[PDB]
């Protein structure tokens, strides 16, 4: 209903899930998918397959609003962080660029014992 046809794709990849958002050039989102959006429920969502199908689910949802050009942004290390990218390139969406923007603190906040 928008006809954006150019914009950004954010891959949020953790060890428990891989989830993909697609926005317009200004950053405001359009559609999105994830490991849970497709049928997967538990630990399966943080798999490269779920990463693939999630990237492709949002990539077809963006075809509705007419997306062709896509700028990829990646945050987090995760299984299928790369597999969601590789899926995104073959989605028909012409991938403009790929950037890794994973936030790293300058040692500011005390992590949970899990990360200690």
């Amino acid at each position: 209903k928008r006809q954006v046809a150019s914009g950004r794709a954010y891959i949020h990849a953790s060890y428990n899930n891989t989830i993909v958002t697609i926005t317009d050039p200004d950053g405001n989102p359009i559609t999105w998918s994830s490991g849970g959006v497709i049928g997967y429920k538990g630990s399966r969502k943080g798999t490269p397959y779920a990463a693939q199908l999630a990237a492709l689910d949002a990539a077809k949802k963006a075809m509705a609003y007419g997306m062709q050009s896509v700028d990829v942004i990646v945050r987090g290390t995760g299984a299928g962080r790369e597999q969601a990218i590789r899926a995104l390139q073959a989605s028909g969406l012409q991938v403009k660029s790929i950037v890794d923007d994973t936030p790293v603190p300058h040692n500011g906040c005390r992590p949970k014992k899990k990360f200690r």
Binding site: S97, V99, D100
Partner: peptide, 8 residues
């Protein structure tokens, strides 16, 4: 302070 890596 920090930049964005265009690769990967």
């Amino acid at each position: 302070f920090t930049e964005k890596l265009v690769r990967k």
